[PDB]
Design a protein around this ligand. Structure first.
Ligand SMILES: *[C@@H]1O[C@H](CO)[C@@H](O)[C@H](O)[C@H]1NC(C)=O
Lengths: 48, 50
């Protein structure tokens, strides 16, 4: 079971992580049943 | 989930993910019913010493 917990917070700090408390609500409980050992995030380019 | 109790209206603001509730004993104290998604409080039936 692959659990995705998520939280959106309105912040106004410029560079680093804000200091505070915010509990992440569970978003998606996903029935995959596969082995996961490595991950990679996806970014978006801007073309001009 | 099996059990005995009186099902009553409740004022506990459950969050969308939250389904049931548990007491100190870990016995279910509130539950979200399927099909109608409402939140029913579970209060153990009256008992005592005769
Ligand atoms: C999951 O993958 C890792 C690395 O590929 C491997 O060492 C491990 O034995 C795998 N586990 C299962 C249950 O396949």
């Amino acid at each position: 079971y692959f659990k995705i917990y998520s939280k959106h917070t309105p912040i106004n700090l410029v560079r680093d992580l804000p200091q505070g408390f915010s509990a992440l609500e569970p978003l998606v409980d996903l029935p995959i049943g596969i082995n996961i050992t490595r991950f990679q995030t996806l970014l978006a380019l801007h073309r001009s | 989930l099996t059990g005995t109790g009186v099902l009553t209206e409740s004022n506990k603001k459950f969050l969308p993910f939250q389904q049931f509730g548990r007491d100190i004993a870990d016995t279910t104290d509130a539950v979200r019913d399927p099909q109608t998604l409402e939140i029913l409080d579970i209060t153990p039936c009256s008992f005592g010493g005769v």
